[PDB]
Amino acid sequence: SGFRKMAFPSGKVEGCMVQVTCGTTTLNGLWLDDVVYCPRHVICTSEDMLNPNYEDLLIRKSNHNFLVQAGNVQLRVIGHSMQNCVLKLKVDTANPKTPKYKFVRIQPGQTFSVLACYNGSPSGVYQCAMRPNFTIKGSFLNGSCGSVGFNIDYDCVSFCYMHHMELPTGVHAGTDLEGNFYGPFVDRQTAQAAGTDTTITVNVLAWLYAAVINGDRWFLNRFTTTLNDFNLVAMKYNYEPLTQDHVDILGPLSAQTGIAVLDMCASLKELLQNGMNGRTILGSALLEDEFTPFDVVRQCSGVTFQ
Amino acid sequence: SGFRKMAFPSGKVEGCMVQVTCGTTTLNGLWLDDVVYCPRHVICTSEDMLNPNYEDLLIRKSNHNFLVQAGNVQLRVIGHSMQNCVLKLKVDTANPKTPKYKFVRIQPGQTFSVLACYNGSPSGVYQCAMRPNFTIKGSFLNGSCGSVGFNIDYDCVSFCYMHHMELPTGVHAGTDLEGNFYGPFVDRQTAQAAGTDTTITVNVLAWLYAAVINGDRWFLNRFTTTLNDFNLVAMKYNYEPLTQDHVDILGPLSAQTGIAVLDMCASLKELLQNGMNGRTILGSALLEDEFTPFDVVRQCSGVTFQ
Ligand SMILES: *[C@](O)(C(N)=O)[C@H](C[C@@H]1CCNC1=O)NC(=O)[C@@H]1[C@@H]2[C@H](CN1C(=O)CNc1c(F)cc(F)cc1F)C2(C)C
Ligand SMILES: *[C@](O)(C(N)=O)[C@H](C[C@@H]1CCNC1=O)NC(=O)[C@@H]1[C@@H]2[C@H](CN1C(=O)CNc1c(F)cc(F)cc1F)C2(C)C
Ligand SMILES: [Ca+2]
Ligand SMILES: [Ca+2]
Ligand SMILES: [Cl-]
């Protein structure tokens, strides 16, 4: 028993982390086979960043301008191109530790692990969600750019995120591994603000199922609701609409606990309208929306990876 | 910016995890050089566990009775002994992935990462604290026994915990790597209860320093207090006494923020007596006591490991 915010084991991603230096700028790179992926603003100095011409700045650079280190060892760059907001540096050595991997673009509401890195060396690992407003609530300092976020499915690392920037309010923005931003953000030092966020309703329900499984059951009421009446209440409290797909995805947790999704919706409606009255659920005083239904089943079923 | 509950990168510990089977019972082992460390109750069946004679049960076992798998590969056991609550199985192959490591016995209040494992395969990683009552608030299912907890100091893995058991209220108990229990617990299925817990005062202060560093400053008052007057208030709210050692350990965060430890004590006293009035600190509605001063400086300074 017990429920913790749990990250994927980081070992397969640790073996892929390198340092990329171009001039004054060092950040992190991801070394898969014979390619290093990093943020394209490694080619910028301090003044450049207000409004850089990347395509232009990159012409003034030769392969030899990029210093790539995998721990001690220097990797020799033998090619380089820009894809959207990411650099691909071809190196003369394939990474012998390259895991089986995929590049995925995750959906808002989905979770992943971040391996926070400085100078190509891993700092820590923590679980995040892609917020509805396409930001993450991370912990990133200057030097963390190029750190990646990922899921592991048995032996396969699905890379979904590369860190580029911080926004007002201490939230973070980045790209998929094809260098396309999540949300409307751009890799320029301009006035950019995150959209208003919303609470990921399906994840809050998944977490109430995690509470029941763990014997924290005080908030279960005797009532049901319709999907329509539920979404009218959710709307007031800045919660995303619950869809039928969301209901279907909650099916297995519903069946394991013997609590219909619409009955759990009736309990969430009461919590939203009445508050928690100083009580906790799974040790928390606020409703948690950063656990997917999959995360709940995995953690409560003890699913493992290669 | 941003503050997350962050685990150590798990890669060095992942390479040490194996499966140990004795009869019907499979749990996890830690393979360092040519020795596998696991919980000694791997030699028990279901009925044994009410009050096992370990010394006795272990005599009926030969080396060949222990099936040890490192992924696919079987390891051949060529020796076995019991040290307190742990088995040492000598194997004919030294682990080529053995990191530089130490066995440490941590102090209550100190944090570590758990690599949750099933059938020798890693599940997830999360940060825990050794509670004052010698329990941890973990996430452990049947099959997780032998999972280890650890700190990384640059290249060196300090093993401090091996998982043995769950207690009433969904909290967990285990041993150091010399097989001695943290707290008064025993590896028998008896009525055992955790002592009353207390809040780790020094860690709450470290976390308020983390809030200020991150620009969450609303709870800072204009007052100071003496150490004695502070500890009289702490006592009422079931907080540990703050010692001079604790004050000295908070010195660097005090200096970085320009807030004397006794001034921050005055602010915590007001929070304890008045509550948070529906406000949050670093996104939390409750005071957090599972971040050490070291954890705060590391996460806010971007310290990395080999
Ligand atoms: C990254 O380049 C690195 N070397 O680590 C760095 C990471 C951030 C520093 C602080 N925390 C981070 O995650 N990224 C950047 O410096 C990016 C790059 C230029 C500006 N920028 C920002 O993050 C700007 N941040 C910012 C705010 F957070 C808030 C605000 F009001 C204005 C800001 F500029 C690029 C986007 C090219
Ligand atoms: C471990 O042996 C394994 N194979 O994973 C297992 C781990 C626990 C199962 C549930 N969560 C765990 O962390 N340990 C045990 O089964 C230990 C071993 C015998 C009993 N036991 C318990 O954990 C008993 N738990 C228990 C309570 F949690 C609460 C309660 F009121 C009574 C209990 F027995 C040993 C201690 C030898
Ligand atoms: Ca050269
Ligand atoms: Ca044999
Ligand atoms: Cl909370």
CATH at residue B275: 1.10.1840.10
Q: How far from A239 is each of A137, A215, A234, A268, CA to CA, in Å? A: 17, 25, 5, 11
* Helices B293-301, B201-213: crossing angle, 10 deg rounding: 20
Q: Please state, as a whole number, how many other Cβ atoms lie within 10 Å of the Cβ of residue B174.
A: 29
Closest ligand 2 atom, CA of B172?
13
Phi, psi of B6 (to 5 degrees): -120, 130
Tokens of A247: 């209901």
d(CA A96, CA A103): 19
Query: Would you call B164 a catalytic residue per the annotation?
Result: no
Whether B11 sits inside 8 A of A10 (CB atoms) is yes
Q: How far from B260 is each of B227, B263, B298, CA to CA, in Å? A: 12, 5, 20
CA angle B179–B182–B188, rounded 5-degree value? 70
CA A146 to centroid of chain Cα atoms:
13
Closest approach of B231 to chain A, Cα-based (Å)? 25
Residue B283 is which amino acid?
G
Of residues B149, B295, B9, B129, the one with CA closest to residue A8? B9
Query: Would you call B145 a catalytic residue per the annotation?
Result: yes
Range of the domain at A291: 201-301
| Nominal resolution (angstroms) | 2.0
Tokens of A151: 């899921």
d(CA B286, CA B284): 6
Beta strands in B42-186 (DSSP E): 66-70, 73-75, 77-83, 86-91, 100-103, 111-118, 121-129, 148-153, 156-167, 171-175
d(CA A182, CA A105): 9
Q: Which residues of A98-110 are buried (b: 16+ CB within 10 A; e: fewer)?
A: bbebeebebebbb
Residues of A (160-179) whose Cβ lies below 8 Å from B: 166, 170-172
- Domain CATH code at residue A86: 2.40.10.10
d(CA B271, CA B221): 10
d(CA B16, CA B29): 8
Ligand 2 pocket check for B27: Cβ under 6 Å: yes
Ligand 2 pocket check for B140: Cβ under 6 Å: yes
CB of B137 within 8 Å of a chain A CB? The answer is yes
* Mutation to test the B interface, candidates A125, A142, A152, most B Cβ within 10 Å: A125
Question: How many residues comprise chain A?
Answer: 306
Tokens of A182: 């999540």
B106 sits in which H/E element: none
Residues A20, A36 contacting (CB under 8 angstroms): yes
Residues A233, A272 contacting (CB under 8 angstroms): yes
Q: Which residues of A266-284 are buried (b: 16+ CB within 10 A; e: fewer)?
A: bbbbebbeeeeeeeebbeb
d(CA B185, CA B84): 13
Closest approach of A58 to chain B, Cα-based (Å)? 29
Q: Please pick, among B145, B163, B172, B265, the residue that the annotation labels catalytic.
A: B145
- Residue A174, burial from CB neighbour count under 10 angstroms (0-12, 13-18, 19+): buried
Q: Which residues of A67-92 are buried (b: 16+ CB within 10 A; e: fewer)?
A: ebbbeeeebebeebeeeebbbebebe
Tokens of B227: 């150490």
Tokens of A175: 């790209």
Tokens of B53: 């004679």
DSSP for chain A, written as a single string: ------BPP-HHHHTTEEEEEETTEEEEEEEETTEEEEEGGGG--TGGGGS--HHHHHHT--GGGEEEEETTEEEPEEEEEEETTEEEEEESS--TTPPEEEE--PPTT-EEEEEEEETTEEEEEEEEE--TTS-B-----TT-TT-EEEEEETTEEEEEEEEEEEETTTEEEEE-TTSPBSSS--SSSS--------B-HHHHHHHHHHHHHTT--TT--S----HHHHHHHHHHTTBPPPPHHHHHHTHHHHHHHT--HHHHHHHHHHHHHH--TT--BTTBSS------HHHHHHHHHT----
Q: Which residues contact A254 (CB under 8 A, 6 or more apart)?
A: A209, A260, A261, A264
d(CA A249, CA A297): 11
